[PDB]
Amino acid sequence: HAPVVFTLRTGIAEGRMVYIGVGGDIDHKINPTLVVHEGETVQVNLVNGEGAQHDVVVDQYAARSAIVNGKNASSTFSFVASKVGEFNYYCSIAGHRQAGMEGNIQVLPGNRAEMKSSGADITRDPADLPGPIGPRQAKTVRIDLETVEVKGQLDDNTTYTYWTFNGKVPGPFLRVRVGDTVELHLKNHKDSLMVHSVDFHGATGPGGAAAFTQTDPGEETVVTFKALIPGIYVYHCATPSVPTHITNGMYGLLLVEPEGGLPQVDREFYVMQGEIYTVKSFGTSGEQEMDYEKLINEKPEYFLFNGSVGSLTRSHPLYASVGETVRIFFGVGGPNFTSSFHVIGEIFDHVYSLGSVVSPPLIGVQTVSVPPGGATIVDFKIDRAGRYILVDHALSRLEHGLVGFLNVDGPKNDSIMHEGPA
Amino acid sequence: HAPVVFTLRTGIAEGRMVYIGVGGDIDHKINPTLVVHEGETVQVNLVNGEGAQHDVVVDQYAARSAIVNGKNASSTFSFVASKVGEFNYYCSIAGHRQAGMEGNIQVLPGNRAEMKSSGADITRDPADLPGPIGPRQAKTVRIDLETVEVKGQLDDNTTYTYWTFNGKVPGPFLRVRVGDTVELHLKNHKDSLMVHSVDFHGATGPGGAAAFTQTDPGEETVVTFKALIPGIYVYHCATPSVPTHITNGMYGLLLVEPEGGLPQVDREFYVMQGEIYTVKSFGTSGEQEMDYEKLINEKPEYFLFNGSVGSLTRSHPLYASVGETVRIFFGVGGPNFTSSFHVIGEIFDHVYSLGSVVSPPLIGVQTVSVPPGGATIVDFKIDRAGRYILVDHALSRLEHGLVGFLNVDGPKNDSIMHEGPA
Ligand SMILES: [Cu+2]
Ligand SMILES: [Cu+2]
Ligand SMILES: [Cu+2]
Ligand SMILES: [Cu+2]
Numbered sequence: 001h002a003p004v005v006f007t008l009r010t011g012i013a014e015g016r017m018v019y020i021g022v023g024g025d026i027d028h029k030i031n032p033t034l035v036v037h038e039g040e041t042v043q044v045n046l047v048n049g050e051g052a053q054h055d056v057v058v059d060q061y062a063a064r065s066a067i068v069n070g071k072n073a074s075s076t077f078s079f080v081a082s083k084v085g086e087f088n089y090y091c092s093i094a095g096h097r098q099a100g101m102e103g104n105i106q107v108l109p110g111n112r113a114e115m116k117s118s119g120a121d122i123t124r125d126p127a128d129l130p131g132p133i134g135p136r137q138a139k140t141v142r143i144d145l146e147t148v149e150v151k152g153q154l155d156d157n158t159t160y161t162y163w164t165f166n167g168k169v170p171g172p173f174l175r176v177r178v179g180d181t182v183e184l185h186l187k188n189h190k191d192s193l194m195v196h197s198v199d200f201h202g203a204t205g206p207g208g209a210a211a212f213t214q215t216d217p218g219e220e221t222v223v224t225f226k227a228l229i230p231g232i233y234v235y236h237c238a239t240p241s242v243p244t245h246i247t248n249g250m251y252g253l254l255l256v257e258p259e260g261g262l263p264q265v266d267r268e269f270y271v272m273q274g275e276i277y278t279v280k281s282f283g284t285s286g287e288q289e290m291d292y293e294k295l296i297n298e299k300p301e302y303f304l305f306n307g308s309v310g311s312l313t314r315s316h317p318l319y320a321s322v323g324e325t326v327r328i329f330f331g332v333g334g335p336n337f338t339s340s341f342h343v344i345g346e347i348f349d350h351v352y353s354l355g356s357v358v359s360p361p362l363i364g365v366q367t368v369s370v371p372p373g374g375a376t377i378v379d380f381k382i383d384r385a386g387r388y389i390l391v392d393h394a395l396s397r398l399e400h401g402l403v404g405f406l407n408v409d410g411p412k413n414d415s416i417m418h419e420g421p422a
Numbered sequence: 423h424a425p426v427v428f429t430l431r432t433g434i435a436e437g438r439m440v441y442i443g444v445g446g447d448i449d450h451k452i453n454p455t456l457v458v459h460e461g462e463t464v465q466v467n468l469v470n471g472e473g474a475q476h477d478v479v480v481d482q483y484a485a486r487s488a489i490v491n492g493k494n495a496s497s498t499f500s501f502v503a504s505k506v507g508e509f510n511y512y513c514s515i516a517g518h519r520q521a522g523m524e525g526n527i528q529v530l531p532g533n534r535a536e537m538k539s540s541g542a543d544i545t546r547d548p549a550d551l552p553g554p555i556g557p558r559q560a561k562t563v564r565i566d567l568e569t570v571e572v573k574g575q576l577d578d579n580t581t582y583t584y585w586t587f588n589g590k591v592p593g594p595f596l597r598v599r600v601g602d603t604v605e606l607h608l609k610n611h612k613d614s615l616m617v618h619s620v621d622f623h624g625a626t627g628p629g630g631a632a633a634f635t636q637t638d639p640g641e642e643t644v645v646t647f648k649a650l651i652p653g654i655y656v657y658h659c660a661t662p663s664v665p666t667h668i669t670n671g672m673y674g675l676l677l678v679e680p681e682g683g684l685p686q687v688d689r690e691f692y693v694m695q696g697e698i699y700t701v702k703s704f705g706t707s708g709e710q711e712m713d714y715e716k717l718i719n720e721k722p723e724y725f726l727f728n729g730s731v732g733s734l735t736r737s738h739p740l741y742a743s744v745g746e747t748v749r750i751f752f753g754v755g756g757p758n759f760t761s762s763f764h765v766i767g768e769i770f771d772h773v774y775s776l777g778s779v780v781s782p783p784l785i786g787v788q789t790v791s792v793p794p795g796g797a798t799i800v801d802f803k804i805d806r807a808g809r810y811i812l813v814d815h816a817l818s819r820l821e822h823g824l825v826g827f828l829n830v831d832g833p834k835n836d837s838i839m840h841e842g843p844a
């Protein structure tokens with residue numbers, strides 16, 4: 001899947017010079033055992049804790065970090081765990097392994113267990129959206145939203161109180177045609193602590209409907225509005241604190257299609273990016289809580305596609321076939337960060353700049369900047385097989401949970417790309 | 423002389439696990455060279471700084487500390503530096519010597535250089551007192567005292583602002599007879615910042631004379647008083663802050679002889695103990711300053727015989743001959759600590775309890791408690807040769823500067839004490 005990441009700081013613990021695990025299953029453990037599965041790419045982050053000179057060397061794998069001299073100095077490295085077995089990792093600096101700097105890597109056969117937690121699955125499946133609208137004239141379309149607060153799985157062994165539309169993140173993908181009148185019914189579940197509401201960027205008028213949809217727990221609110229302008233629009237809860245309702249999960253997409261629909265495509269996907277601001281650092285397991293200082297000061301701990309870590313890699317990856325033309329509806333709930341959306345190994349044939357559906361799309365684009373509260377549409381033909389990788393190209397975000405897979409079967413080598421010379 | 427003491431704390435410095443010097447000529451130096459002279463007793467104090475397991479081993483002397491496990495854990499040890507040359511000291515814990523824990527001891531030939539500093543010598547020679555008074559009739563005795571503030575030598579390469587009677591610590595030994603009338607002329611030097619005065623414990627009347635002797639810089643004060651009761655009395659400055667004037671050096675002894683005089687003795691000595699409360703720890707060099715918090719909370723850094731570190735060891739030890747009956751007039755200026763006065767290798771034949779010169783002295787006593795603002799007289803016959811050692815037997819004080827020598831020349835072995843069986 002994605003690399004398994006372990007973080008080690010050096011220091012003095014239990015009477016010796018040692019490595020100490022940070023986060024995951026190794027948190028605060030001295031010389032922790034790093035357990036890994038055959039064929040995984042293993043990444044190790046070494047951070048210098050006390051200021052002596054260190055490295056990490058993996059015995060038999062020829063893998064090592066750079067040497068790290070001062071306090072905080074850091075070195076990151078990886079290796080493919082291709083041989084089952086036990087392998088020491090140790091510091092090669094004179095005396096250090098003897099002083100105590102040594103632990104084990106266990107390469108186990110088989111595949112890593114699925115992620116588990118005591119929380120609900122809150123992920124939107126990227127194939128979970130309505131298809132192109134049929135050959136219909138304009139009508140009144142009824143849409144139902146329900147606002148629900150739920151303990152959700154954020155990561156392996158890690159949970160969070162999400163606030164959602166209809167129990168998943170992003171909310172339901174709404175699809176209407178320009179000229180439609182939308183009759184929106186918003187129920188706020190009676191267990192909710194908060195009032196919830198909705199602001200559609202595709203709606204015209206007070207709060208984009210928020211003025212009409214502030215709904216108490218157990219109540220229902222109804223609003224009707226005309227869809228006047230085609231485009232791909234974000235919607236989100238708009239009860240103060242708005243950035244808090246958004247970071248907790250309350251965002252979704254609304255497509256107002258042009259009269260004759262968007263160009264036809266073999267397959268469509270639904271993806272949104274957001275942030276979560278937890279008291280504890282990324283990778284720390286257990287029950288997570290919002291940290292308001294991190295929220296207001298724009299210091300995220302998690303960056304997420306569709307609600308959770310591994311949402312689009314392990315739980316609900318994207319799948320297509322070679323020769324298919326694919327469309328991604330991509331939006332940023334945020335609340336704060338502009339995404340530099342890229343599919344590793346592919347090129348966008350068409351990009352609907354700033355989510356404009358009326359203007360001609362741009363042609364042949366690697367990466368598209370998408371602001372919080374903004375959406376685009378990207379289309380591309382898949383020419384050949386591979387695992388394509390959805391990322392925000394601010395690539396430090398990879399290591400905060402932001403990565404998605406698009407799986408396409410077929411041969412490794414072909415005329416489009418192959419090993420060896422031409 | 424006394425042992426030469428080196429303190430080493432363990433830590434991470436300059437990128438390695440090392441020893442770091444504390445105080446003396448080695449302060450903050452990584453793996454300091456400990457320079458020593460042939461025949462010196464070398465004491466090494468090891469304090470664990472960071473919490474890894476440590477010792478110190480001295481390579482060819484086979485002297486070592488105990489192992490020290492947690493932060494602050496300490497071990498102290500010594501060896502006689504009997505061979506000239508260069509010797510490694512190192513940590514024997516696996517990996518630590520390679521990690522950086524090693525330095526040198528240089529044993530040099532010859533004798534350690536004399537103590538020096540930019541300060542004046544403020545020490546009172548312990549032979550510097552008037553001898554027994556005649557068989558006179560009572561009379562009027564004129565005493566002159568001058569109060570001077572002077573930068574004095576506190577230790578090798580270390581200085582302090584002393585406040586003194588007549589430029590030394592303790593002030594002059596005053597010696598009169600019961601029935602005498604003392605006419606005191608107290609001059610306060612014109613460069614003094616402070617007013618100074620004097621309170622005599624052998625004086626009867628307001629402030630022990632202090633009400634008559636508050637003396638401005640540049641001025642003189644004169645007071646006449648009767649000496650009504652024989653005894654050995656402390657006197658000291660009595661200007662607020664009194665414990666401040668006392669700690670800075672303003673204390674002395676006044677002997678009021680009984681009518682018949684004290685028992686005749688071959689030799690008499692003058693010794694007083696006091697404390698100094700410096701901002702930096704004992705053993706740190708440079709210009710020292712008074713720390714008021716340490717003074718008022720009774721946390722001394724220096725404990726001193728006659729003014730200074732090495733006053734009665736290197737500067738002017740006591741000297742006597744075998745078979746002499748010797749008398750020490752011993753007083754405690756303080757300001758705060760009770761002394762447990764003891765001469766190692768000898769026994770007090772007579773102790774004048776609480777400074778009483780009228781009651782029969784106690785017989786055959788090892789150690790005498792002498793409160794601050796109190797004095798005694800001890801007499802003993804010196805039966806054989808040796809270096810006798812004046813101590814406050816609260817023996818941690820040895821390391822805060824409190825030690826004197828009484829040097830008696832002659833054969834090491836005799837019928838009173840000798841090596842080997844009887
Ligand atoms: Cu190391
Ligand atoms: Cu809400
Ligand atoms: Cu908005
Ligand atoms: Cu050590």
Ligand SMILES: [Cu+2]
Binds near residue numbers: 585619659660661672
């Ligand atoms: Cu004074």
Ligand SMILES: [Cu+2]
Binds near residue numbers: 658795
């Ligand atoms: Cu007094």
Ligand SMILES: [K+]
Binds near residue numbers: 346347381
């Ligand atoms: K393509």
Ligand SMILES: [K+]
Binds near residue numbers: 768769802803804805
């Ligand atoms: K004796």
